[PDB]
């Protein structure tokens, strides 16, 4: 919990206020373009279930991963920015992303 994007955003979005979460990805694309992936390339999810979808294009993402030296209360994150295809699992109506399955 210091100044770097992952430590800041993980805190603000209530992911590390009461625990240190090991890894989390943030997508820097408009919400409706991320929701548009639910009608893009259908693929199997890691768990075999088939409600996962892979984006046609790469998207700007930041991976946040806890350092070996991180301990609650002072979570610490390595920040890695990349452009990757995201795979999300979709449910509901409207069919919207409910889980991040990976980036590729």
């Amino acid at each position: 919990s210091s100044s770097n994007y992952c430590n800041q955003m993980m805190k603000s979005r209530n992911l590390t206020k009461d625990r240190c979460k090991p890894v989390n990805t943030f997508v820097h694309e408009s919400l409706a373009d991320v929701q548009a992936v639910c009608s893009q390339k259908n693929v199997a999810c890691k768990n075999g279930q088939t409600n996962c979808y892979q984006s046609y294009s790469t998207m700007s993402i930041t991976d946040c991963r806890e350092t070996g030296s991180s301990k609650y209360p002072n979570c610490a994150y390595k920040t890695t920015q990349a452009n990757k295809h995201i795979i999300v699992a979709c449910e509901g109506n409207p069919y919207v992303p409910v889980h991040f399955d990976a980036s590729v």
């Binding site: 990805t25 943030f26 997508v27 820097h28 408009s30 991320v34 509901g92 992303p97």
Partner: peptide, 15 residues
């Protein structure tokens, strides 16, 4: 309370 779709957005969207 928070739906699974709202939770995906709070945890992963940075539009």
């Amino acid at each position: 309370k928070e739906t699974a779709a709202a939770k995906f957005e709070r945890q992963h969207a940075d539009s």
